[PDB]
Amino acid sequence: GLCIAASEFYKTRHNIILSAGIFFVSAGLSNIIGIIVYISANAG
Amino acid sequence: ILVGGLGLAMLVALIEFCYKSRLFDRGVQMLLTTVGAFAAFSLMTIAVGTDYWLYSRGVCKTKKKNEEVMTHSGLWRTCCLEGNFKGLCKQIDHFPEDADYEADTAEYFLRAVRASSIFPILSVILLFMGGLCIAASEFYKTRHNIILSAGIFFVSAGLSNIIGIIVYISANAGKNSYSYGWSFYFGALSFIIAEMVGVLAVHMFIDRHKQLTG
Amino acid sequence: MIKKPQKSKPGVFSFLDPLAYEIWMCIVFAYIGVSVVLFLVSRFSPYSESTNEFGIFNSLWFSLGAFMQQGCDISPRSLSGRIVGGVWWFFTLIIISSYTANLAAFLTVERMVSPIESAEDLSKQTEIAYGTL
Amino acid sequence: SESTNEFGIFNSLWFSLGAFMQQGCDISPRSLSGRI
Amino acid sequence: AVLKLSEQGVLDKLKNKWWYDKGECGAKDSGSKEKTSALSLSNVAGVFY
Numbered sequence: 001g002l003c004i005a006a007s008e009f010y011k012t013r014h015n016i017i018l019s020a021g022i023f024f025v026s027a028g029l030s031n032i033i034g035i036i037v038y039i040s041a042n043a044g
Numbered sequence: 045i046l047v048g049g050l051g052l053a054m055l056v057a058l059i060e061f062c063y064k065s066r067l068f069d070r071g072v073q074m075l076l077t078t079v080g081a082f083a084a085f086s087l088m089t090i091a092v093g094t095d096y097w098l099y100s101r102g103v104c105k106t107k108k109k110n111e112e113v114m115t116h117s118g119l120w121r122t123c124c125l126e127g128n129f130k131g132l133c134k135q136i137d138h139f140p141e142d143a144d145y146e147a148d149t150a151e152y153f154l155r156a157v158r159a160s161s162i163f164p165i166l167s168v169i170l171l172f173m174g175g176l177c178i179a180a181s182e183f184y185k186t187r188h189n190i191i192l193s194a195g196i197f198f199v200s201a202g203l204s205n206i207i208g209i210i211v212y213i214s215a216n217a218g219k220n221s222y223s224y225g226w227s228f229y230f231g232a233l234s235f236i237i238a239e240m241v242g243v244l245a246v247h248m249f250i251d252r253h254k255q256l257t258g
Numbered sequence: 259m260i261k262k263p264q265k266s267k268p269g270v271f272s273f274l275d276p277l278a279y280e281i282w283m284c285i286v287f288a289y290i291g292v293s294v295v296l297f298l299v300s301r302f303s304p305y306s307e308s309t310n311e312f313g314i315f316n317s318l319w320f321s322l323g324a325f326m327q328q329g330c331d332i333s334p335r336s337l338s339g340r341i342v343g344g345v346w347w348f349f350t351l352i353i354i355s356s357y358t359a360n361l362a363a364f365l366t367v368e369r370m371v372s373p374i375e376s377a378e379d380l381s382k383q384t385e386i387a388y389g390t391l
Numbered sequence: 392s393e394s395t396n397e398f399g400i401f402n403s404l405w406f407s408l409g410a411f412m413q414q415g416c417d418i419s420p421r422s423l424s425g426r427i
Numbered sequence: 428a429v430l431k432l433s434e435q436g437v438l439d440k441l442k443n444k445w446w447y448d449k450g451e452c453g454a455k456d457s458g459s460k461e462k463t464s465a466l467s468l469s470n471v472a473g474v475f476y
Contacts (some may be wrong), residue, residue, distance in 0.1 A: 039284075056337060141453075243400065347413075
């Protein structure tokens with residue numbers, strides 16, 4: 001959410017836009033694993 | 045491990061981009077394969093000449109027969125440690141038990157292959173024979189198809205290695221919680237390299253062929 | 259004479275039964291995120307650009323035909339492109355083969371045991387009483 | 392000329408993989424004694 | 428005098444002697460009901476061959 005605003009201010013570097021979406025996909029990776037271990041904790 | 049492979053997969057995807065943002069050295073590849081093959085020629089012969097491959101609990105020498113002695117066991121010398129006499133290395137073969145199952149000629153032949161290093165000794169042979177021809181690329185050279193037959197011996201050595209592994213493991217059951225000596229891994233580790241060498245011979249053959257075609 | 263101990267009937271979705279309610283929700287989550295990373299590494303500025311075949315939902319379609327055994331049309335070629343797929347192959351190999359093992363287990367038997375008769379436990383247990391007129 | 396066999400070392404490794412899986416691949420040996 | 432050797436377990440040492448120190452016919456079949464056993468490699472022997 002930080003880097004998506006940075007496409008106007010200090011722009012035309014235009015590869016920092018690419019690193020932004022990396023964080024979103026890796027967040028869902030961090031989301032999905034926390035789902036499992038909480039469900040693993042329920043019967044655990 | 046599903047999720048763990050993903051960011052692992054993504055990580056390798058990143059480094060290719062920066063590496064292109066800004067094998068190698070043929071000829072010393074010819075020098076590279078020698079030190080690989082010669083060290084592979086060592087560790088094969090190391091594990092062969094080794095009294096210890098697996099740790100287990102057996103006896104030292106019978107007929108001593110107390111209960112059981114931990115064993116520094118390998119191919120020929122089933123030598124024992126941790127006992128009233130440590131390091132007394134017995135020679136072991138097949139033994140005639142009750143009625144011997146001679147009609148199991150598949151088993152008796154399997155016994156006949158077993159008490160022998162026949163494939164692990166042959167795994168040395170072509171590796172030694174392949175070690176002969178790799179030096180012959182300078183002296184009496186420019187025949188350049190004898191280089192191709194050299195890597196055949198290395199790959200076929202690993203074939204001779206892998207089959208000897210099985211029959212020795214087949215001999216073990218042929219709980220106890222036995223373990224392995226590190227020297228047992230050496231034939232398995234050299235098995236890798238004996239294949240890793242001979243593939244590089246094919247490159248050097250085909251590039252010399254590519255230099256032949258021009 | 260004892261009671262009638264209440265057998266439960268199968269449902270409409272009785273084929274979904276040999277896998278618990280969570281994993282069905284869990285696998286779809288895993289299904290999507292697998293596909294996008296494939297599509298992530300699919301289009302990554304090949305240093306024309308019109309090089310790869312893995313499109314937006316086309317990446318999703320490869321993930322499905324790999325999952326259910328029907329095959330596909332085109333294979334990944336990149337080192338990173340192929341290293342994701344064999345994982346997903348290894349995933350779908352374990353999961354739905356394990357599904358069949360449980361799926362056979364439902365078609366074996368449905369007999370509720372209806373506890374121990376010719377009674378003889380009325381002599382032995384202290385749990386269920388028993389009387390006469 | 393001769394650029395016949397598509398099988399490099401990586402694809403031969405790769406075809407080995409999916410053969411052990413269920414998922415086939417497009418590359419196939421096409422030639423005798425490799426086909427066997 | 429019997430009660431000493433039983434209390435000293437010398438009978439057991441003799442029971443080991445005349446039954447178990449002469450365990451000869453090395454069959455050793457007991458049989459476990461657990462079907463959780465992985466297969467042997469030797470069960471899949473000729474497949475590699």
